[PDB]
RNA sequence: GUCUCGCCCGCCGCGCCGGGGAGGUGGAGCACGAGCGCACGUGUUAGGACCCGAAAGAUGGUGAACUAUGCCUGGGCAGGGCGAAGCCAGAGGAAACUCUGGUGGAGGUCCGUAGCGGUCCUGACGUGCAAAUCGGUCGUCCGACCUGGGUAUAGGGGCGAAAGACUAAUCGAACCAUCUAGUAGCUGGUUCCCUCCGAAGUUUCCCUCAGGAUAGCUGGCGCUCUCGCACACGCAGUUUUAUCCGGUAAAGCGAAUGAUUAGAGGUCUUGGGGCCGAAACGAUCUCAACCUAUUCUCAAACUUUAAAUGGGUAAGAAGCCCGGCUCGCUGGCGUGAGCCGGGCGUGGAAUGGAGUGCCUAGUGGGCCACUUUUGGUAAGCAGAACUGG
RNA sequence: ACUUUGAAGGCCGAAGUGGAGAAGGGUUCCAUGUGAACAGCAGUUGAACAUGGGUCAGUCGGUCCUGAGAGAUGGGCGAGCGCCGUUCCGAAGGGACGGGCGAUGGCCUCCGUUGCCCUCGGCCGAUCGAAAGGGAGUCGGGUUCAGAUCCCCGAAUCCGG
RNA sequence: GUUCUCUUUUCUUUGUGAAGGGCAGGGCGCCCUGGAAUGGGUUCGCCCCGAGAGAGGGGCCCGUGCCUUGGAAAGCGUCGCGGUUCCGGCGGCGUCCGGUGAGCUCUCGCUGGCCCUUGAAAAUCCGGGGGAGAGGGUGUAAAUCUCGCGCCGGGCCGUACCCAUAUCCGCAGCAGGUCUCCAAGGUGAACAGCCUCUGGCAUGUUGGAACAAUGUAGGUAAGGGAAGUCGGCAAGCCGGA
RNA sequence: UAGAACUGGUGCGGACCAGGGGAAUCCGACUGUUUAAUUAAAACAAAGCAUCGCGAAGGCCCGCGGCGGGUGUUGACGCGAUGUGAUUUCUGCCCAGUGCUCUGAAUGUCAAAGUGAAGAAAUUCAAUGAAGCGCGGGUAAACGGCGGGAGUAACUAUGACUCUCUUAAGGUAGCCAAAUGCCUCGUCAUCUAAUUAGUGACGCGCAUGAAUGGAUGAACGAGAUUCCCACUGUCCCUACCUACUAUCCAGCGAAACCACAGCCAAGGGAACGGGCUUGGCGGAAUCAGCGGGGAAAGAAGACCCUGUUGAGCUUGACUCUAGUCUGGCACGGUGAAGAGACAUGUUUUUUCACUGACCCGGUGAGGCGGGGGGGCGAGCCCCGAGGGGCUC
RNA sequence: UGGGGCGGUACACCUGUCAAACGGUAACGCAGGUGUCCUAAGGCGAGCUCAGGGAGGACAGAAACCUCCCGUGGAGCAGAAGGGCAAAAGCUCGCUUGAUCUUGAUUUUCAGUACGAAUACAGACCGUGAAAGCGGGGCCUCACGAUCCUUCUGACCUUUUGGGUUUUAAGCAGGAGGUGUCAGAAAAGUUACCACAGGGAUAACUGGCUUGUGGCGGCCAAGCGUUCAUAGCGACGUCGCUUUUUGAUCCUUCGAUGUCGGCUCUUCCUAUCAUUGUGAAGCAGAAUUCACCAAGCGUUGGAUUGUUCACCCACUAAUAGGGAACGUGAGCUGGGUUUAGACCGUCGUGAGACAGGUUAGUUUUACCCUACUGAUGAUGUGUUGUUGCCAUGGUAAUCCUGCUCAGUACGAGAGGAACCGCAGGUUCAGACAUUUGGUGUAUGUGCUUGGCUGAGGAGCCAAUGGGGCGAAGCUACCAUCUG
């Protein structure tokens, strides 16, 4: 046959991603001394658009422990911010929207973002524009924590992860239709090669195992094997229902 | 060498050494040696293999100056129509709100130039201006827009708003060289003369039916003999004299098997749409069949009978006769076969020189006519026997 | 008939059949002469043939910077020519400086200096990459068969020492 | 230039660079007094005001425009001289007033709208901050994120012409294709189409004679009006305000 | 810009520019893209709708190879993979077949190595026993599929009703002679002087039917069809005109093709001759045309057959393979509990813990663990109230 | 393989016939069979009679069982058919296991090779019979399978590698495990995106032979026709022609004969629709029906459909049938069919198929030879000219209506003709332009838009600026003349 779509995504130089008007990577400062112990401030700059994102971005400043210099660091953004506020990070810090501090001195039942999933991972987790999770238990023996996440999954982390308090900023997006094609373009140009799928089926069988024929129909079961190989693998992946 | 019955020998150490006869038998063997080397010719093979002839497969490599798509950075697009939110004013209303007149200028909106494209004329040209052009008529024209250059992706791989489309006039797997004189049961071609002999298209076997092997048909090279050499035997798409074989033509059914017509003597006899009647075998008919003697017609898969043409043997010296020997075979005594030694030549017609052994090619698609003959309405149709072309 | 000069009639109609340039071409440019061949007829003409001549910069462009991206070192892998990868498993800059020490040739005054003892040192990755992106500063007049923001005249200006 | 009649007529020509100094003119999200409703000011539109409007007086930026130095000597237009000529030659005049615009183009500013799109980086240069570090004596201090004036230099490579119905690719002087700048008069809504001026050309690889047939491109037709034909195919009607 | 008079042989957007309409059905919502050089379409795409896997030692994928690489400067309002196709109104039953999927020691089967008995030893035997296949559940907006006979209503005909045989269910709501109906030019109405056409109705539908999407319905279409008004040389029926040619002359000047050649009837023949046979007949060299023949030119017929010649594509053909699941040996070390088969200790094993090989992330490798010199304080003990012990 | 595919097996075997009197002999020729069955259905000996038919006998009947007579096979012998068999080869009883071990020869098919099957002998061991003798499978004709590999049986059997012993392995001889495509490969589909070497040894058009089917026509004559075989029809039977129907065949053509239908144009046939000249009726008149000579002139306009065929409207003297490579594509068109894209239904798991439907889709070349039409010229006559004759060839005129004859003849009536005459028309043909119309660049004369020659006048430009009237000429059943 033929390499069909997807089996040439993997290897890049046409599907990779556009990067040139980003404007970094977002993730919360390394571990030190003071933010281990007692707390450390920081001040709010300016708010900004990313491109390929849905989530502002904020701009902080921190004075430096140990040299006469400022640093930068790009935070994801809690929904409240402003600029002129003071920021303050690590564990002496008071439960409040937009500071950041570990989870085993929260209490129950409260929300986060920007969450780590192992101790110094500079943040992971629930970084997406209307989403948060949320604490569950504690438990002081043994130094662990259970955290729900917004696929409805509870999961064990640590005690000193860190996170930051509050939703993401961009809440309540996708209750917008879009109408139009043309801004879909413009929406996906901006992220990767992506946008039209032509369907397998107005293919013909060089090229996908689902094309040809007189007609337009599979001919054959669209769930597949778990282990199936490369080419073979489209479909209902491992699908344990089909309907509703 | 190999089975079957067997009685014996020699050896300083007797076995699980060695020897006879034959029912007999398996062998590319013996029996008074013929080969070895050199050259030439023909023939069968393996090699590029008489010459030219593919679609294709492998190894290694050049290509994105056309086109497909993504990114970086730069440029480009008359004049007009409809009139969304928002704003002002006047009037009404108890209120919420509403009516009328302006302003404003949104939109993968409308008409239309540049530009980008490419419907119809199924027009022109159709050895052209042109290996895809020209003319008028067309489509869209602030946007999933048009475009320059730079940069990424390379061949069972790339890219694809998908048509199996494009990848340098080439794509249902590019091009360049080599492997490579790839293979071909198949097409086309094969170079001077005279003489001589002179065919087949049929059998059996083959994943055989456009082809090969096998026998047959043909040629060449010989060799053993003999004759008008006063001097003979042997042969034959032939006739004759004797003698066997056959079951086809015709004929036959008052003879078997099978089929079939009609009336005379049988209610033979079962029963009657019924029959004169209580009906019966009192009668009286008959019918599907049915006893006796006769009658008309039939047979590739029936036959008592039985040709014409045909096939096989025989027509003498390898015969006849006389006498005697050998035999585990057979046995009243004897038969039979084999060996020995003697005596007796024309054995129906008409013809002519016979026999034997190696090497060996081309063929292996057939066709017609009398006569006989199968299928078919018939055929310049299909399939066979005889002879001749 | 076709060259040239003059006169007359006509077309292009400023999104041009006009005046200048990029890519590409490469002497085709300018004068004198020729009429074999070529210019699908002709030619006293020619982008043809022959012989000669012609492109001048501190300020116009390159050169400099980086872009998408390509690509060495260390390391790793690989039969092997080599391939991956670009801060990733690296004692990764010779960077400089104020002070002290003996020396230095010039009238060792002032120096740089080969040399150290000290002394502050991050950067974070060699290098390449656009004659349309970024990047200091020149204008007018005149002059040739053919050259001008370059030659001559006259008025300015940037950088460095 | 026209004048046979008219035409105070029609046509052409009618200027000042770079770099400075001064001033018009636009813009300000700049300051000081002061305290606003009977709410005001204000744009085509918007929009603004005790977080300080209107009204008064001030400051800053751009100032491609006018004046001035350049610079009238130079250039141009006319009427005349000399040099045989081999001449940037010599003269006499001039190089002037005003005005309108939904006008076209180029540019500078103000302001608003659209975006699940948010619209490059680096070389290089600059100012500020405690003064770190210090440095230097009444005539010194050397840097200097520098006031005006003589000085010295600024290397290498390209630069001719064509840029297209004849210098490029298409075998060719091929009706094809190939990125940009400048852009007048009239009609008209208009860079539509029709005629003209500046600048360019000789009808697109040849000419003369005559007007048969069939062609190709254009047109017109009495009366009827799709009866034609697979099919109103092609042509024709309507057409702007 | 609006209005009035007068004037012209009704001519007046006077040239150029410059939309034919209307009534209806089928498809696709629209804008957009597409087979360069025969197909621009009803085909692709889209927005909307719905399912599927995945919480990072991960999912999808690349790769000869590696602390390799892409999505990823990412983190479920996201990344990858699939089908339908705006809106409105709806989305019916079948888990028998096939696929997918869950668990599972409790059951057959099930390889290497390992365990044990016999033998002089190769060897043989036995017990053991992983994934997978079977055993069992869930799923149809997963591939897909969704029936016959007979009797029956006070005139006939129909047949609401009843009986019956089998299937995983036996076609629901809608719709139809359609771009889907062989018999077929189905039947009835209308359009017409006349209609195998077209519109509306009927429906035991050879063989319609529900995201293999059903039914509708405004605007748009270089889409496919029927009819009507105006219009016309499309036609009755052809004619006239203008330009460039063709034609003649001067000058320059090719090609394809070509056995030999070039008047007919009939006869026979490889059955349809220019040439043969029997008859008809036969007179130099040429000019403009036209298209009957030359079975005219081009391209070793793509239709059909054969070949023990091929290639593209598929699968339940045959033989294999990358990748992937799983068991075993090595790298593999420390300690502690529990329980075994033989036989009267052996190793085995399940579990818990450790770190030093190994792996991961972060950092300009910047303050780790104990300790009390700590002390601003607190609470717990002794407590000379002064101390030190504990929790911080 | 009477083209291939679907079907069948004529692919290994047996009987009868065809097959032409030895033997042998073909076709998808006729009729049928096989891949088995048997501890006896094999083998010896002895004894007996079969099918059926008749006559009798308690229940007893068409048929149970008993007895007698006739009985040439008319019954049986495993299966298909054929042959053969009576104190058997059949039925019944007794005993057994020649269905065993071993060489070689021959026959059948045939090359004169193999398998298989069969025959006659020889050596052994045996069985049955009193014994002669018979028996080494089934009364005869068919019932089955190589190398290589594996497994079993056998001999105090050879080798196992420098010698010896034991195990294993290899050898020798004989059975079995199997190839049905049966003298013997290990094996699924599709291509409309397709390709190559060849083929008229082989198909889809024409042509050719045949004429079953289709069409047309004769013979004899039972009945029809109230009566009356034959005015006109004609059963049951039978003899023929034609190639405008569809078949059968496969001779030419596969290095190419351009494949449906309409448009256009010419010629030919007769099996006569009408018109001319005539005959016959169940012919009073008028209309109609049968037939003869005859192919001269005619046979139309339209809705539907791609149509050939069909069907309806309307007029007409009439609305007849055919051909020529199923006339005619360098003459048109390209609607359909018959490439490439695509949509539905049915089938296939699927790529894909449909003899089902639907939409879009490149139609080349003449300047050669001939023929055909037109145009110059040529031979000879001494040269040249004027006027003329004729061979030979073509060939052209055709139908209808109206008034009169006449509401006459005829006929009961209803109704209803014709011959000569007069005037006119259709289709065709040949010229012509007085008059009407059309053309119009005489670029003739006015009018008018935009622009340009300073303006007026006079003029030009816009591939014929537009529009109005229009001479000569060319032309029309759209005007006229003639046959
Ligand atoms: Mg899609
Ligand atoms: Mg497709
Ligand atoms: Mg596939
Ligand atoms: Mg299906
Ligand atoms: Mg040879
Ligand atoms: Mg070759
Ligand atoms: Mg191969
Ligand atoms: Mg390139
Ligand atoms: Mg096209
Ligand atoms: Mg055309
Ligand atoms: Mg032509
Ligand atoms: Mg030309
Ligand atoms: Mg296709
Ligand atoms: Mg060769
Ligand atoms: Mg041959
Ligand atoms: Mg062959
Ligand atoms: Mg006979
Ligand atoms: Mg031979
Ligand atoms: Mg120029
Ligand atoms: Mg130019
Ligand atoms: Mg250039
Ligand atoms: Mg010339
Ligand atoms: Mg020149
Ligand atoms: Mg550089
Ligand atoms: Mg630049
Ligand atoms: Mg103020
Ligand atoms: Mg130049
Ligand atoms: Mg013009
Ligand atoms: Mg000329
Ligand atoms: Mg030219
Ligand atoms: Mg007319
Ligand atoms: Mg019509
Ligand atoms: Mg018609
Ligand atoms: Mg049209
Ligand atoms: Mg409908
Ligand atoms: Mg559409
Ligand atoms: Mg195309
Ligand atoms: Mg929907
Ligand atoms: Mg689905
Ligand atoms: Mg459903
Ligand atoms: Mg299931
Ligand atoms: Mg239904
Ligand atoms: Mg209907
Ligand atoms: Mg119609
Ligand atoms: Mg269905
Ligand atoms: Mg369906
Ligand atoms: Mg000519
Ligand atoms: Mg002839
Ligand atoms: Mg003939
Ligand atoms: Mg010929
Ligand atoms: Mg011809
Ligand atoms: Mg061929
Ligand atoms: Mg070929
Ligand atoms: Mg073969
Ligand atoms: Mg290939
Ligand atoms: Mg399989
Ligand atoms: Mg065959
Ligand atoms: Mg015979
Ligand atoms: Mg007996
Ligand atoms: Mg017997
Ligand atoms: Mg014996
Ligand atoms: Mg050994
Ligand atoms: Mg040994
Ligand atoms: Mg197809
Ligand atoms: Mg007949
Ligand atoms: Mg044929
Ligand atoms: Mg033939
Ligand atoms: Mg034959
Ligand atoms: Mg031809
Ligand atoms: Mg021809
Ligand atoms: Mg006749
Ligand atoms: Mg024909
Ligand atoms: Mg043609
Ligand atoms: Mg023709
Ligand atoms: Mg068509
Ligand atoms: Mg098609
Ligand atoms: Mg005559
Ligand atoms: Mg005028
Ligand atoms: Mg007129």
Same mark, same amino acid.
């Given at each position: 046959?033929?390499?069909?779509?997807?089996?040439?995504?993997?290897?890049?130089?046409?599907?990779?991603?556009?990067?040139?008007?980003?404007?970094?990577?977002?993730?919360?400062?390394?571990?030190?001394?003071?933010?281990?112990?007692?707390?450390?401030?920081?001040?709010?700059?300016?708010?900004?658009?990313?491109?390929?994102?849905?989530?502002?971005?904020?701009?902080?400043?921190?004075?430096?422990?140990?040299?006469?210099?400022?640093?930068?660091?790009?935070?994801?953004?809690?929904?409240?911010?402003?600029?002129?506020?003071?920021?303050?990070?690590?564990?002496?810090?008071?439960?409040?929207?937009?500071?950041?501090?570990?989870?085993?001195?929260?209490?129950?039942?409260?929300?986060?973002?920007?969450?780590?999933?192992?101790?110094?991972?500079?943040?992971?987790?629930?970084?997406?524009?209307?989403?948060?999770?949320?604490?569950?238990? +504690?438990?002081?023996?043994?130094?662990?924590? $259970?955290?729900?996440? *917004?696929? &409805?999954? !509870?999961?064990?982390?640590?005690? #000193?992860?860190?996170?930051?308090?509050?939703?993401?900023?961009?809440?309540?997006?996708?209750?917008?239709?879009?109408?139009?094609?043309?801004?879909?373009?413009?929406?996906?140009?901006?992220?990767?090669?992506?946008?039209?799928?032509?369907?397998?089926?107005?293919?013909?069988?060089?090229?996908?195992?689902?094309?040809?024929?007189?007609?337009? +129909?599979?001919?054959?079961?669209?769930?597949? $094997?778990?282990?199936? *190989?490369? &080419?073979? !693998?489209?479909?209902?992946?491992? #699908?344990?229902?089909?309907?509703?």
């Amino acid at each position: 046959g033929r390499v069909i779509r997807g089996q040439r995504k993997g290897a890049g130089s046409v599907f990779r991603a556009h990067v040139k008007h980003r404007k970094g990577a977002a993730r919360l400062r390394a571990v030190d001394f003071a933010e281990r112990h007692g707390y450390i401030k920081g001040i709010v700059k300016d708010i900004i658009h990313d491109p390929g994102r849905g989530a502002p971005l904020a701009k902080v400043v921190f004075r430096d422990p140990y040299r006469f210099k400022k640093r930068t660091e790009l935070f994801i953004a809690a929904e409240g911010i402003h600029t002129g506020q003071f920021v303050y990070c690590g564990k002496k810090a008071q439960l409040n929207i937009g500071n950041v501090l570990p989870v085993g001195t929260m209490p129950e039942g409260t929300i986060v973002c920007c969450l780590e999933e192992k101790p110094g991972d500079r943040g992971k987790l629930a970084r997406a524009s209307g989403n948060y999770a949320t604490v569950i238990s +504690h438990n002081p023996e043994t130094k662990k924590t $259970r955290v729900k996440l *917004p696929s &409805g999954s !509870k999961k064990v982390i640590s005690s #000193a992860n860190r996170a930051v308090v509050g939703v993401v900023a961009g809440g309540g997006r996708i209750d917008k239709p879009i109408l139009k094609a043309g801004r879909a373009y413009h929406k996906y140009k901006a992220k990767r090669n992506c946008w039209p799928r032509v369907r397998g089926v107005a293919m013909n069988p060089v090229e996908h195992p689902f094309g040809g024929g007189n007609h337009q +129909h599979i001919g054959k079961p669209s769930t597949i $094997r778990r282990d199936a *190989p490369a &080419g073979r !693998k489209v479909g209902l992946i491992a #699908a344990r229902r089909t309907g509703r």
